[PDB]
Subunit: 45 residues, 6 copies
């Protein structure tokens, strides 16, 4: 009954964690790329 509500709560909370995992992974890469771009623009300037 409530064991329903949690088994749904879990299945969904795992699917979103996986989502976060790939995302956080991506944003980290973009953050490092932006860092490099900043320096590139700074250098030529």
């Amino acid at each position: 009954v409530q064991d329903l509500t949690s088994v749904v709560q879990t299945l969904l909370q795992q699917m979103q964690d996986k989502f976060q995992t790939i995302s956080d992974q991506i944003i980290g890469r973009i953050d490092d790329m932006s860092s490099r771009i900043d320096d590139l623009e700074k250098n030529i300037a």
Copy 2:
């Protein structure tokens, strides 16, 4: 605006209304047995 809770108050309502439907049928059956028990009463 809906969370898991909401989902489990739908599933709880469903099951309730489904128990309601069957206890209702059992009640009508019990009603029939009661009348039969009165006739048997008035026979013994």
Copy 3:
């Protein structure tokens, strides 16, 4: 640690316990009919 399976063993338990509840009520009804059939027996 839960997969879809888990979800369908909750839904299966729910439905079971709900069949259990109604067969139980039917059994008590059948019990009542049995006593009435004995009185009728002892009347015929």
Copy 4:
């Protein structure tokens, strides 16, 4: 190829077959009461 609809035609089938199972048991009970009502008939 499945959407929410699909999910709610499974849940609707489940509940149906579960109502079918209990009305069936009620019917057999009603059947028993009918025979008892005939014996009582043939006693009064």
Copy 5:
């Protein structure tokens, strides 16, 4: 009964909106980064 189908439809439509939100957020950043990279390559060239 149908109130089931919607409560599932919603819980899922919220989880995907959150997904879109982070994504659209990310693609926007990449789009601006590509813009800068284009200019960097154009300049040195």
Copy 6:
């Protein structure tokens, strides 16, 4: 009964495929951007 478990398994497996689709799409873009940044840093250097 099991037809439940699959209809849930599917609805969820589609929502994650869509997720992957956008992601794989994004990572590919970042991978090409990193490639260009590498070359930009290599050139000025």
